[PDB]
Symmetry: C2
């Protein structure tokens, strides 16, 4: 046949590879739809797509343009300036699970760019929020230069992770970047992270999503982005190019980001959400999979009701034979072409469920992922829990590869440092990387990702300022977010407290950071914790394109003492050999002390934890935490012929809370405590911690 | 020409040109006046003798003789005789020549430690004939009359003060050798200097027996005469130069603002019992002047007798008016007479709660020394006693109608361990006294701070420095009059010997060499003396009241008086520093102590005996003071302070 006025020949094509692929002076399209009775290929143009008008349509022959359940067609010519979609026909029965309709033009799941809008937060032509979408037709060749980029391949034990929101990182006016809120605005700030000690960035979801899902209903916005439309394409409204050049520019922008990050020694880990899609339940848009083969992609009940183990309306059928191949191809695409270094899986315990619902001991999807020759060399971090009731923390089909977030760490550290009884043994266990959870099954201490604050919940500053949540601007009447925050307002609630309360809060924040940085495992903290970012007591800000979610670069200058403390702690962890251990610590390296050396207090009323550990580069170090409300003079280990020299004391005023060989009068400061240090003594305030280093006494 | 004579004065005087000699006796049936020439006295020959008539030259029991002429270059004695019955109580003998009890000078020897011809330790003595006119210029003088509550007494031995070769003085070990160093004392803050006995005494009294010498000088021959062998002139000019040199000292001291308190011993004399030579008293009236052994010397001076009482009163008046002495100490101590005398009533009378008071007689507080030595070293049950001592011992003096400044506080003296020995030795080492280490106090209440002796570790030495500073702080914050002993301010040590009465050796000298090596302790002591004399609360005229003095423990307002308590803290309301907080930690464990809460104010470090010098006492002369306070501001802001074991601290309340 012919497609465009006789210029393009139409042929049978090939059923693989799926998607649209350029070759042989033409483009081959292939899709999978088992339940379709008729299919046609729709072609738009940039001008007609913004009219909801199809410029061309090629009907597909069920005989010569279908192999098995895979429709395919080859069109000769240069279509790389056009956008495409599919029209399917067939059975329609919501109560049976069929959602075919000829009036809808759907987007290929394998499309590498989805073009519907170019401006963030700006409705469509006439106040619309769900305009027509179309996918990008590839080009015969690539148009990006990597400049010899190669994988960094850091050992996971050497990582310090930083969780970043791409828009909120530079969208505040104080960022003073050329393109605030985009992939290029982020690049100008990468050196800052490099000086902070960060060598790994975790991006919050940067896959195509609609920020205007809720805008029509209640004028809210999907700021965080945990509702994905397509998985092969980056968010085009996080780029400066926009829909320009059919989206190719946006792709290159993302690539640019990654490349630059590798030239500063920073790795990029993508946050992916495969457990649900933007299409919602039966009352929602038909953009994608639902319109192609619903029964194949979504997990339904026998009566046609969608299984909802995420709270978002549906549940992706992760373990179905086709869905597993789709997911593996997504991951390999993001690794081999966008040069990503690893992935984080949100609500990971939905990929371990049956393709009905029943948790699987050896899920096929995890099996394929961990056995892949390409995905075996990249980091895989799992947030092992879901909204249905599963908590696979410590028990996850890890295959001796998968890492995992540690929420027990968060709870234990929060309660201990706030001053709860019965948490000294748990805190001591946390400081060693939880051997009882990861050593038994054959995993190393660095398979645990440690954190005390994330994007969901109180920030580090709110953790020491508010007893309760204040989610009133969310519009839910406080009926949202965590109810048990394990926080302490340090004696007076709100930001307007006395000077003693403020000093105590500063001590507490420094104590949390020290706990993170001296523990075995991979530390992680959310952007803005290094300078005390606050959200006003709101622990669930999923819908605020407001300054509360933005990095405040002006406030970073007012609190640069805390930033200095945090960067110095990261440097110290990097230097100390004993803090990045590959294996679990042993009783021959690590010793536990109490108020007196060698006499730990593991009882239920204990609120003091101290240890000392040998080190090949620093000789030996001593760390202590006093979470009681009364000060104490503690005795230090006896080391004939050596002396303990102070390094870190969170109770002292800056810059003396961390001593470096840049202070003009460090020796005088040490001398004025020498009369305690010579006796192997050290006085400590309530709610503090100290780090000392052993040096030759000569 | 020999004339009759008159009873008054009971001595020798140059009035009525000529000399009138009068002597009281009770059994002198024969009496004559011997006159010696100094060259003849050296040869032990009498060059003149004037017999006295029992009727023409005697009124009642007083012999008289008046000689018209010039005897200014002549010495004298008496040929008294009468009943001789040692087994009955009489010691009259004409063959011997005695010295007038009221003689102002005694001329036997002129070089300290150098015996007479053929090694004679007891050569013949004679008295000096006075002049009818004065010879010394006071350059204008008047009593300083300091209130006794404002004193800081410094006990010094005259010879040992500037006899060591490191003193670098023109006349080491004399009266005029210590005048140079008086300025040094003024730098320490000494308001008063107390002299160990400077009456005429024989340093070779028992040198013939064994080989020991008498160094301290607690044995008196003449009560009117200064020690001539402590002067550069010696016997020159009949000794009248010596009496002037002493005066010079007093004068110069009064020009530095320092008073002079004289240590007197009227409870025994060098006469011995019946074995030593008869110098005076026994050869005139051995009954009136002696109680025919409670002093430990061999005799007592019969304080209770009208003749003896008048003698003592006249001696004290002579010293006060002729020599301008400001006060007296009475060893091992008539009383009403002295206290009611027109002149001696305004003199500072100090006696070594049981001694008659009359609201005048101060006392050496020997109970203070025992309690303070036992609290500071660490001992159970002394928290209450220590707190009592800090308030001037009300239970001893307030009850009797006295004042806190009638208590003389000390922890060290000339007998016993020095300050450095209290923290160095646990036993006494008197084997150098040649008495089988049996002569000496056995209950020293000391502690070697761990290892005993001068060769210990570093921690022991640090603890010793802390302990010495703690003792001095204890002294300087207490209500009463503090006293120190020569050399404590730099760590003088006797080598463990707590009784050096018989050593004219470097152990009894002021080692000016060492004071240049322990200058940090001297700095601390001088600064503490400055601190005491500025505060109003530390020199109170009346006992502290509950309205101004408050007692604290590890927590403000919660003192621990139990038998396990080893921590004492208080705060006082001042009017020149606002308010001061003092704390003592005699426990072996460090401690963080909470300070009293004062809205709108903050406590600022002043004294901390655990810190290294010069930061053990903060002063504006220290350029780093602000940074040092800043580095403890994080404890100070919350009303906390960390303390080492065995340490004390002083803080001031500032409007911050």
């Amino acid at each position: 046949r012919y497609a465009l006025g006789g210029a393009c020949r139409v042929l049978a094509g090939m059923p693989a590879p799926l998607g649209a692929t350029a070759l042989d002076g033409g483009v081959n399209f292939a899709v999978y739809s088992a339940g379709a009775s008729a299919a046609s290929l729709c072609l738009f143009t940039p001008d007609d797509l913004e009219a909801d008008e199809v410029t061309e349509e090629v009907p597909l022959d069920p005989l010569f343009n279908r192999t098995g359940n895979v429709w395919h067609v080859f069109i000769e010519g240069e279509l790389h300036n056009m956008l495409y979609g599919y029209r399917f026909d067939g059975m329609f029965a919501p109560h049976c699970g069929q959602y075919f309709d000829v009036s809808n033009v759907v987007v290929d799941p394998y499309a590498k760019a989805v073009i519907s809008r170019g401006e963030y937060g700006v409705p469509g032509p006439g106040g619309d929020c769900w305009p027509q979408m179309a996918g990008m037709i590839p080009l015969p060749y690539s148009t990006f230069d990597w400049q010899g980029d190669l994988p960094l391949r850091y050992p996971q034990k050497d990582l310090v992770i930083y969780e970043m929101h791409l828009r909120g990182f530079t969208k505040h006016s104080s960022s003073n970047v050329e393109h605030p809120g985009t992939y290029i605005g982020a690049i100008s700030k990468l050196d800052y992270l490099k000086e902070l000690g960060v060598n790994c960035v975790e991006l919050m979801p940067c896959h195509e999503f609609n920020e205007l899902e809720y805008f029509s209903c209640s004028s809210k916005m999907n700021f965080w982005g945990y509702s994905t439309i397509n998985f092969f394409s980056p968010m085009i409204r996080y780029s400066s190019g926009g829909i320009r050049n059919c989206g190719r520019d946006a792709i290159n922008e993302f690539k640019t980001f990654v490349r630059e990050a590798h030239k500063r020694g920073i790795e990029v880990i993508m946050d992916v959400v495969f457990n649900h899609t933007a299409e919602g339940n039966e009352k929602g848009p038909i953009l994608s999979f639902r319109g192609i083969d619903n029964s194949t992609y979504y997990m339904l009940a026998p009566k046609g009701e969608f299984y909802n183990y995420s709270g978002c309306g549906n549940t992706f059928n992760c373990n179905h034979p086709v869905v597993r191949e789709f997911i593996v191809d997504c991951l390999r695409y993001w690794v081999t072409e966008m040069h990503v270094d690893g992935f984080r899986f949100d609500l990971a315990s939905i990929m371990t469920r049956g393709c009905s619902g029943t948790p699987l001991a050896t899920p096929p999807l995890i099996d394929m992922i961990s056995n892949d020759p390409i995905l075996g060399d990249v980091k895989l971090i799992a947030e092992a829990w879901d909204a249905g009731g599963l908590y696979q923390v410590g028990q996850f089909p890890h295959w001796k590869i998968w890492s995992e977030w540690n929420g027990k760490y968060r709870d234990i550290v929060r309660q201990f440092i706030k001053g709860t009884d019965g948490f000294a043994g748990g805190f001591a266990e946390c400081l060693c990387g939880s051997p009882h959870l990861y050593q038994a099954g054959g995993r190393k201490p660095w398979h645990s990702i440690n954190f005390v604050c994330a994007h969901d919940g109180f920030t580090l500053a709110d953790l020491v300022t508010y007893n309760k949540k204040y989610n009133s601007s969310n519009g839910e009447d406080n009926r949202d977010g965590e109810n048990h925050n394990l926080s302490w307002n340090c004696g007076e609630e709100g930001e307007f407290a006395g000077l003693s309360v403020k000093r105590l809060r500063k001590r507490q924040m420094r104590n949390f950071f020290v706990s993170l940085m001296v523990s075995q495992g991979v530390p992680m903290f959310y952007m803005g914790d290094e300078y005390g970012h606050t959200k006003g007591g709101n622990n669930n800000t999923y819908c605020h394109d407001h300054y509360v979610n933005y990095f405040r670069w002006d406030k970073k200058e007012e609190s640069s003492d805390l930033q200095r403390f945090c960067s110095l702690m990261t440097k110290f962890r990097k230097q100390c050999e004993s803090l990045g251990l590959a294996d679990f610590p042993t009783a021959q390296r690590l010793h536990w002390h109490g108020h007196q050396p060698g006499k730990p207090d593991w009882s239920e009323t204990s609120r003091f934890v101290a240890f000392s550990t040998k080190d090949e580069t620093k000789g030996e170090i001593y760390v202590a935490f006093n979470a009681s409300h009364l000060p104490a003079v503690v005795g230090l280990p006896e080391r004939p012929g050596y002396r303990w020299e102070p390094l870190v004391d969170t109770g002292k005023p800056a810059p003396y809370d961390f001593l470096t060989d840049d202070l003009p009068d460090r020796a005088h400061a040490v001398h004025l405590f020498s009369h305690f240090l010579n006796s192997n003594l050290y006085p400590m305030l309530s709610y503090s911690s100290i780090i000392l280093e052993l040096q030759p006494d000569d």
